[model samples]
Target: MAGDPLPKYWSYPVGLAVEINNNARYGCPHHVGRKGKIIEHLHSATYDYAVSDETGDITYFKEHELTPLKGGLAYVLEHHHHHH
Candidate 1:
């Protein structure tokens, strides 16, 4: 699925940059907060996303499990905005 937008719902094209945000909403692998790139879309098999870190660390995570490194203030507003 190279050069194609990911599956429906949370569709993102390949080679996009992202930040790991597991959120603990599900029990998957443990990963530190770091920047990575969208390597591939699981194509409804493994499902969701397959992301890779700068040093070859890869994991499959759901859509909301990550944020765009293309974000700055956008991340704050999108994820955490409990200004109380």
Candidate 2:
């Protein structure tokens, strides 16, 4: 209702605005809501790019560390519930 339902696969494109979720378990150094672009989409759901709260000084994020901004890119938010 509030956020877009996760789809079955990720379809984020280059130049898409994205933010790194703080809940990500890896050693992500980017802050939540930090804006970045989709420079490249790596195979196996990995992405590579940098973000910035400023016009310059963009901070690059590690692969697979970014999420599409609200209404930005198409992503399948993985869910825990599965059919038995």
Candidate 3:
């Protein structure tokens, strides 16, 4: 999906479970094997994908920074917000 808008839901074209790629160098906080859901997609010059871990911790990653895991929405962390 080149130059396409972020998936509306958690899992659409790409499954929810994804592994953080080692090539990530743009401040991605998630670990290499850390699994997370495509919670949010930010369309821009550089498409940003938001992956949320089991603890509701969200980290913004680039498109190439993710590797899809097998199966459908198997794990969905409850959406939470932290106010500073």
Candidate 3 lDDT, 4-84, residue by residue in tens: 565653323333677777777555533655667887766654545777865667777666777787764558654685764
Better of 2 and 3 by lDDT: 3
- Segments of candidate 1 deviating more than 4 angstroms: 1-7, 45-47, 71-84
Q: After superposition, how far is residue 26 of candidate 1 from its true place, in Å?
A: 4.5
- lDDT by residue for model 2 over 2-82, one digit each (tens)? 986556444466677776667544554445545666655444434345455334555556445667767734675557759
26-68: candidate 1 lDDT, tens digit per residue: 5554674666788888755334678898779787766667787
The 10-residue segment of model 1 with minimum total lDDT is: 24-33
lDDT of each: 0.70, 0.56, 0.64
Q: Which run of 10 residues does model 3 get worst, by summed lDDT?
A: 6-15
lDDT of the structure predicted as candidate 1:
0.70
Deviation in Å, model 3, residue 31 alpha carbon = 3.5
Model 2 accuracy (lDDT, Cα): 0.56
Ranking by TM-score: 1, 3, 2
